[PDB]
Design a protein around this motif. Structure first.
Motif, short mmCIF file in Angstrom:
data_model
loop_
_atom_site.label_atom_id
_atom_site.label_comp_id
_atom_site.label_asym_id
_atom_site.label_seq_id
_atom_site.Cartn_x
_atom_site.Cartn_y
_atom_site.Cartn_z
N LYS A 1 0.91 -1.23 0.41
CA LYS A 1 -0.06 0.20 -0.28
C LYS A 1 0.80 1.12 -0.27
O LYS A 1 1.39 1.77 1.25
CB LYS A 1 -1.00 0.07 1.66
CG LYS A 1 -1.75 1.04 1.10
CD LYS A 1 -3.61 1.32 0.35
CE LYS A 1 -3.91 2.42 -0.36
NZ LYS A 1 -2.79 2.45 -1.19
N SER A 2 1.03 1.96 -1.21
CA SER A 2 1.60 3.35 -1.11
C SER A 2 0.69 4.68 -0.22
O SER A 2 -0.66 4.60 -0.21
CB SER A 2 2.24 3.52 -2.52
OG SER A 2 0.77 3.61 -3.43
N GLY A 3 1.61 5.58 -0.18
CA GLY A 3 0.70 6.79 -0.01
C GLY A 3 1.51 7.94 -0.51
O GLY A 3 2.73 7.88 -1.11
N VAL A 4 0.76 9.33 -0.70
CA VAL A 4 1.72 10.08 -1.81
C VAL A 4 2.68 10.79 -0.68
O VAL A 4 3.35 11.89 -1.43
CB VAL A 4 0.15 11.22 -1.03
CG1 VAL A 4 -0.64 12.16 -0.49
CG2 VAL A 4 0.47 12.34 -2.90
N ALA A 5 2.65 10.61 1.04
CA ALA A 5 4.25 11.54 1.47
C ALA A 5 5.41 10.48 0.80
O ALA A 5 6.33 10.90 1.15
CB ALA A 5 4.13 10.29 2.79
N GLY A 6 5.01 9.60 0.12
CA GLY A 6 5.75 8.49 -0.44
C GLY A 6 6.38 7.66 0.00
O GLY A 6 7.26 6.19 0.12
N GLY A 7 5.47 7.05 1.43
CA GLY A 7 5.28 5.01 2.10
C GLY A 7 4.48 4.32 1.05
O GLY A 7 3.52 4.37 0.18
N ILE A 8 5.79 3.08 1.09
CA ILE A 8 4.83 1.90 0.46
C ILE A 8 4.96 1.06 1.58
O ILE A 8 6.40 0.56 2.46
CB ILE A 8 5.77 1.18 -0.53
CG1 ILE A 8 5.84 2.37 -1.59
CG2 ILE A 8 5.43 0.13 -0.98
CD1 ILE A 8 6.28 2.39 -3.02
N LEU A 9 4.12 0.28 2.73
CA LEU A 9 3.21 -0.63 3.29
C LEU A 9 3.80 -1.55 2.24
O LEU A 9 2.68 -1.98 2.21
CB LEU A 9 2.73 -0.23 3.79
CG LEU A 9 2.38 -1.02 5.27
CD1 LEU A 9 3.06 -0.26 6.30
CD2 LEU A 9 0.77 -0.85 6.02
N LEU A 10 4.85 -2.64 2.95
CA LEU A 10 5.08 -3.71 2.14
C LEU A 10 5.15 -5.26 3.35
O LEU A 10 5.64 -4.89 4.13
CB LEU A 10 6.46 -4.21 1.29
CG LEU A 10 6.59 -5.57 0.71
CD1 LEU A 10 6.00 -5.10 -0.79
CD2 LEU A 10 8.00 -4.86 0.45
N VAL A 11 4.44 -6.39 2.89
CA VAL A 11 4.14 -6.95 3.70
C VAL A 11 4.77 -8.87 2.95
O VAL A 11 3.94 -9.12 1.82
CB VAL A 11 2.12 -7.32 4.18
CG1 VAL A 11 2.75 -8.21 4.79
CG2 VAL A 11 2.51 -6.47 4.82
N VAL A 12 5.38 -9.72 3.29
CA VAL A 12 6.19 -10.85 2.62
C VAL A 12 5.23 -11.65 3.78
O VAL A 12 5.37 -11.72 5.45
CB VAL A 12 7.60 -10.43 2.90
CG1 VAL A 12 8.43 -11.93 2.13
CG2 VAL A 12 7.73 -9.70 1.48
N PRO A 13 4.07 -12.11 3.18
CA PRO A 13 3.57 -13.41 4.20
C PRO A 13 4.56 -14.43 5.13
O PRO A 13 5.13 -14.45 4.28
CB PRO A 13 2.02 -13.81 3.30
CG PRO A 13 2.58 -12.78 2.27
CD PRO A 13 3.29 -12.33 2.36
N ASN A 14 4.32 -14.65 6.47
CA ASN A 14 4.80 -15.25 7.27
C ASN A 14 6.56 -15.10 7.18
O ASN A 14 7.49 -15.57 7.77
CB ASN A 14 4.74 -16.05 6.46
CG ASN A 14 2.94 -17.07 6.70
OD1 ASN A 14 2.42 -17.44 7.80
ND2 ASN A 14 2.52 -17.89 5.63
N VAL A 15 6.63 -14.03 6.67
CA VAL A 15 8.31 -13.72 6.27
C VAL A 15 7.61 -12.46 6.91
O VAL A 15 9.20 -12.47 8.29
CB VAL A 15 9.45 -13.87 5.35
CG1 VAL A 15 10.03 -13.48 5.43
CG2 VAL A 15 8.03 -15.22 4.54
N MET A 16 8.07 -11.22 6.39
CA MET A 16 8.45 -10.07 7.16
C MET A 16 7.64 -8.62 7.04
O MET A 16 6.96 -9.04 6.14
CB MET A 16 9.54 -9.49 6.92
CG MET A 16 10.32 -10.11 5.40
SD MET A 16 11.99 -9.09 4.84
CE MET A 16 11.55 -8.07 3.18
#
Lengths: 315, 315, 315, 315
Positions: free
Chosen positions: C263-278
């Motif tokens: 999920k990205s955001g206009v502030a430049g963030g990108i929340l990234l999820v790797v299932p069962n990993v990190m």
């Protein structure tokens, strides 16, 4: 002129009126109480020739709100005072592609035309800029009085209050247009919406409205006073747009089968214009699926079939 | 009549023609060689009053293909022989919402109107059903000869051969319409496309085409022979649709600023009609971004500004 | 587990971070000053394994607003407290057809999904109904603290004040949704917009956000506290939607080439999820034409190419 | 591995199969006789683990056409032989915005993805270019035999003959794509359509198809022969697209509630893949409004609810 004997024409209007009367289908608008109030049996037809000759049949003195019928009128005002070029830097000149009042702009981010709500709202923001809503309203009222030759032009505060209180759809359009920079710089958007609701609440009778229509049909000169109310340019522009965008989603069918400039309203009114011949106002609260007065639509078809008034009827 | 002195009107046409001549913008169509051949400097204007009076200026005797200019003509034929009701069970009566020739049907799965390609193809499938293409073509040719008062009506086999050989877009529309059941039962779709390509390849000159336009402007009576060619119903329907769907994506602008029934073609022709006044054919190969002859469009605006011929000009 | 030696994995993250750093394209958002302020050179990447192992590189302690990155989080909250069935009576479950945030509802008059603005606004109206905005905000803040294992979760009042002061687009959506009856009965629409602006203004750091992502990647259990924050159902739903609607108009490309919930955001963030990993949070103010952090996007592609983390990578 | 005891898993499959059997809704496709022939009561489910373990229940040996179920398979072939980059110069990588198979291209004038008809037709034009249809067909057949570990792979000439004889919709798409230059240079469009109809007519049984699915679920290695059939890249790409575009207009719902790569067909088949676990083929002729096997869809929901196979189910 295509009306040799007015008295005989009058007799025909009554016959058509009588025939349309039998059409009881449709539903009276009920999104607000001020509209739901009305009886489905109210039905009036008033004529006002470019000559100044009058004739009414039915409930032609019962006041009702112009609603969308005011759109071409305030547009005519804007063009009269600002000219074609300026007005159209803010609004388009043709039928919106899909659904009527779908809410979206055209290629240049302008409401498609003055007859859809988004366009009427923008047009409203162009009238007498700089003064407060009180003067703006008086200014337009004065202008409508001239169009009506000083006949009935009232105001329904309850319709106004109800329209504003439940106008979420118009506020959405208001903010949408503001974000898209569709208003002249410095426009008080919420203030314009208020002015817009008020304009939709102006009341007329078939009789007074027929004169307004007659003014449009008479090159901008009020048939019963003889004074110039609108510029030739304003009238031509207004009529062109009433021809193609005045009957909501039925505009295409109307132009093809009736071929006359017209503008309907949710109160059941249909402002009808017969260029260089006459002006008319047909009114009956019950509306069809597309928002047009059922009796009015029936009457318009019959009128053209009988008197060959269609734009492209050969004569 | 709005032309007191024809001789003086003629002098004005020449001035407008001369002014339009200076407009060298645009691009000559080049999707097929038969169109790319043409010189961008060809420019002709022919007038034929409802009276039968003629006047040409420029390259008015150089043959060129009608292309889309034939759409209103074959539609007029269909209505003349089958009536409004039957024809419209297959095609709509109004401007397609979005892009012109976007390829999609309306609410009832019918091409939006006779002026878009899908609609013209359907109209083509209604003419003289039952006979072979040879007779169908002769039938229409005969009909066009009558509209032109027997003046130049030729045929370009190379345009025809090139149109068919590269008409993938029309074949796509052909199959699309067949799958949507838009054709009368038992229609040979591929055969209709063939007939359609042929109709697009019929040649005329400004002079002969102006007579065809004059026939439409004269209630369906050919001005130079006096015989009835098209029914009043056919003419009115054709004119209504030329008013709103005859100039591709410029139809809306054209109706608003010019207000006259017209139909353009990719060869650079513009069939122009002035109800009860005259018929005209303006021709210049260079087209603008919307597919309309640049000189022709310029000329049409000037003509209306000068002679106040706009549908809703007050007079 | 696909990370045998964390220390070595860390070394790779630094290499990828270093490589992404060279990507200086993009534009820092500037519709409000609070976003335009930021330097284009800020670039941080924080990792938080399902294990609880941490690693940061770059500007991982500089606070920035979650903006759209909060959408999946408040959605997760809604599902956690109300369940899948209830929440989805108000919002859809899939990618909107055309342009992202085009403003229109789906077949059932519901915003297409929780990730587009109209949908997030509706989701916002479902959280802790009945209490005032002050408590609603505290409630969500508490919830985010738990997701972050009590790490940095601040609030930017200036972003909030600027967002509300210039949010004409959201007000248009607000009124539009109210008119379409998209909110639970009795909802104070304007009040919800206020709450929505506040949620978009919550601040985090790469470090704290990576923990939030890790909680989603860990079946709803915060990796550094071990407590259950979100229900399994909430997590699965959130991840499904981040997979297909989390990167605006790049969602389709992202799912295909990266194949990870994000999920990205206009502030430049990108929340990234790797299932069962990190869980991860990549942040760099400069955005591409589609609104996604240029460095973040580059980094995500490289991460999957190197460590084969793609959803459908075979292992 | 999530299947400790296969024998017990088998017992569950039978229970789910038995439950789905009670779902008698839906309509067997009838646009061609070869599909209308089928009994609504046919219902089969075959499993083939990545291990090579098998299990069938119901009508798992009755041949039926792959129809759209072949789309992901020929796409996998194209990527295997040409690579991701080349194949995608002709077709997109994501869900078409609106209606499935609405017929229109994306921003770059490419079919949205390999799963819609326009896209499958384009993909078909990429396979073994240069040779005649006979060899092209043998080539693909050989490839499918390898995917099926040499189990049942037949061909239905009647379906083929009927598909071609009534494929006006596909011919429209064929010409449309040719006009838009979507095919590699020199492509015999009509010839490709022929090859396409043939591919849609290839027959399989639940048993043989489950092996094909197992090959996709096993990184491209056929579970019962051990040989490499498809490249890792081909498998990953195919699975990504089956996840988001494999169930027509139900793709969005399917991904959200089932979260497994799948592809339905009008014959009632549903090719289901459980990454690193197993491959399955569910088949029942009766289809729902969206074109998916009613029993198959019911079965898929139950399977995920019971065994927690959802992509984002935490384990």
């Amino acid at each position: 002129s295509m009306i040799p004997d007015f008295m005989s024409f009058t007799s025909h209007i009554d016959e058509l009126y009588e025939s349309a009367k039998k059409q009881s289908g449709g539903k009276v608008a009920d999104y607000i109480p001020q509209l739901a109030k009305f009886s489905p049996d109210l039905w009036g037809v008033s004529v006002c020739t470019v000559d100044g000759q009058r004739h009414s049949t039915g409930d032609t003195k019962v006041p009702f709100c112009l609603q969308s019928c005011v759109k071409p009128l305030k547009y005519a005002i804007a063009v009269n005072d600002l000219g074609t070029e300026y007005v159209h830097r803010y609004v388009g000149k043709e039928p919106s592609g899909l659904r009527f009042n779908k809410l979206f702009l055209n290629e240049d981010d302008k409401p498609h035309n003055p007859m859809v709500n988004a366009g009427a709202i923008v047009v409203t923001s162009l009238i007498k800029q700089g003064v407060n809503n009180a003067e703006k309203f008086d200014y337009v009222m004065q202008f409508l009085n001239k169009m009506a030759g000083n006949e009935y032009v009232g105001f329904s505060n309850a319709t106004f209050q109800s329209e504003r209180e439940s106008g979420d759809r118009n506020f959405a359009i208001g903010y949408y247009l503001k974000e898209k920079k569709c208003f002249p710089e410095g426009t008080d958007m919420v203030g314009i919406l208020d002015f817009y609701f008020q304009l939709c609440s102006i009341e007329v009778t078939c009789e007074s409205a027929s004169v307004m229509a007659a003014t449009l049909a008479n090159g901008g000169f009020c048939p019963i006073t003889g004074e110039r109310v609108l510029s030739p340019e304003a009238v031509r522009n207004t009529l062109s747009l009433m021809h193609s965008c005045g009957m909501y989603d039925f505009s295409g069918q109307f132009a093809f089968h009736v071929g006359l400039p017209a503008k309907s309203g949710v109160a059941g009114g249909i402002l009808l214009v017969v260029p260089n011949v006459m002006g008319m106002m047909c009114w009956s609260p019950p509306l069809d699926k597309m928002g047009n007065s059922v009796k009015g639509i029936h009457f318009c078809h019959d009128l053209v079939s009988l008197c060959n008034f269609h734009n492209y009827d050969n004569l």
